[PDB]
């Protein structure tokens, strides 16, 4: 079954940041979702697997972050 996670794109001051072009990819290279961050946390439901959050572009004035890999385990545990 699927596991609930939340993704937050923030600035250096701990505040949610709008305007980043984001994607979520699985270990086989399939794109699960693409979106533009909107200044709020974004929920996902994901089946077990290895995934990567990848920033395609940052809002004007910000640096692109390194991708974040994580694993959703068979039992709902998520490891970063």
């Amino acid at each position: 079954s699927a596991t609930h996670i939340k993704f937050s794109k923030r600035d250096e001051d701990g505040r949610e940041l709008a305007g980043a072009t984001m994607e979520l990819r699985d270990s086989s290279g399939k794109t699960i979702s693409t979106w533009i961050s909107d200044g709020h946390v974004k929920d996902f439901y994901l089946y077990p697997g290895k995934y990567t959050f990848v920033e395609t572009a940052a809002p004007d004035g910000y640096e692109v972050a390194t991708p974040i890999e994580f694993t959703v385990n068979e039992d709902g545990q998520v490891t970063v």
Binding site: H4, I5, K6, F7, S8, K9, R10, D11, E12, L17, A20, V41, D43, F53, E55, A58, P59, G61, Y62, E63, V64, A65, I68, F70, V78, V80
Partner: peptide, 15 residues
């Protein structure tokens, strides 16, 4: 409760 929070930080460009 207990939903994992995955946080990606966008640093400022020097300008």
């Amino acid at each position: 409760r207990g939903v994992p929070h995955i946080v990606m930080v966008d640093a400022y460009k020097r300008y």
